[PDB]
Amino acid sequence: GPGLTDLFKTEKAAVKKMAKAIMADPSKADDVYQKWADKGYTLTQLSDFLKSKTRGKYDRVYNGYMTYRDYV
């Protein structure tokens, strides 16, 4: 982003955009879940993107996402 902690603008800064977007709205989540498998975004890297922690911010988002491991 435009910060020092997340000074990136690549994937890890890209995924946070959708993370916080799913954080609130779980309807649009389906597309992004597919988009993640679409590029082969693996959960272990997902934890790098959503590395930062905030209550209700990242938890909802990746805890729901990790369920894809039992699907594909």
Side-chain angles (χ1 to χ4, degrees):
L4 183 62
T5 316
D6 184 77
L7 69 173
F8 300 94
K9 47 282 296 178
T10 50
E11 32 57 272
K12 52 188 78 300
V15 177
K16 298 187 181 68
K17 298 182 182 66
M18 285 301 185
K20 72 90 183 69
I22 300 176
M23 165 190 175
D25 165 65
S27 317
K28 151 282 293 77
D30 66 323
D31 171 81
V32 188
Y33 282 40
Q34 262 71 151
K35 199 296 181 187
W36 286 318
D38 156 76
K39 294 289 156 292
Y41 293 91
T42 309
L43 182 63
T44 174
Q45 281 56 87
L46 197 295
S47 185
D48 174 83
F49 312 147
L50 285 66
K51 186 177 300 178
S52 311
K53 294 294 174 292
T54 309
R55 303 178 302 205
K57 207 299 184 62
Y58 303 94
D59 41 82
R60 300 192 68 211
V61 161
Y62 76 163
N63 194 150
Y65 171 65
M66 61 181 58
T67 318
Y68 85 124
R69 286 313 323 125
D70 301 80
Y71 183 73
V72 56

